[PDB]
Amino acid sequence: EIQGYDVEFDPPLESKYECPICLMALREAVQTPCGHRFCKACIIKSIRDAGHKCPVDNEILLENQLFPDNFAKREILSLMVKCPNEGCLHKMELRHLEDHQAHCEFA
């Protein structure tokens, strides 16, 4: 399935941008009314499998109540990451990572 970003951020990713489900940087982040961020894919799967609750505080939560968190989504994509390829030392902003990998030397 689709969980999060697996890329090794240039400085460590801060806790506030880590998905409590998949333990990775939020992918198309969404926020709950109780104030917790998840990936869009991770949280709706839990809604479907675990029920209508926020897994961090068991507060009531329905799929429509989720709003996209485009402030974190911007900051996360602005975070700098390393290209995981063997021998490549290229650090770029996360939004440019697939731009670099498309013509990365070591692949």
């Binding site: 926020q31 009314p33 109780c34 104030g35 709003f67 996209p68 968190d69 485009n70 402030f71 989504k73």
Partner: protein, 141 residues
């Protein structure tokens, strides 16, 4: 709980990161709301924007704020109220309190002036020493 009075100018332990400042009033976010453009505003600053130009446009993107996509940033609200600020008793008190319980600290802080438990006593007293004015130093025993 965990609320604060936005009128006060607080002195933050670490310098206030701009991500916690409102995109319109530039102060620290009070009851932050995020918009569909990905920008945060105080609650009274979103309505203030709503009263003007009909379409409240975002001060940064100039993107039109579609009220269906505005939501309370309760997570950002918590990160803000957990920011540490120095106490109002500036040099005396060494306490680094969180902003959400700033007003609760002054209610117990030793060095905030407690005017005296007396008839009159226009004496200036600290909380630490008012039991020490009932002691011998105030004019009643």
């Amino acid at each position: 709980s965990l609320d604060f009075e936005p009128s006060i100018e607080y002195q933050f332990v670490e310098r206030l990161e701009e991500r916690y400042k409102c995109a319109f009033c530039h102060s620290v976010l009070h009851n932050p709301h995020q918009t569909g453009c990905g920008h945060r505003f105080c609650q009274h600053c979103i309505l203030s924007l709503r009263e003007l130009n009909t379409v409240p446009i975002c001060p940064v993107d100039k993107e039109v704020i579609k009220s269906q996509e505005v939501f309370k940033d309760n997570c950002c609200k918590r990160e803000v109220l957990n920011l540490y600020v120095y106490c109002s008793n500036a040099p005396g008190c060494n306490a680094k309190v969180i902003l959400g319980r700033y007003q609760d600290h002054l209610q117990q802080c030793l060095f905030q002036p407690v005017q005296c438990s007396n008839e009159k006593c226009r004496e200036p007293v600290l909380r630490k020493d008012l039991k020490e004015h009932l002691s011998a130093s105030c004019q009643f025993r």
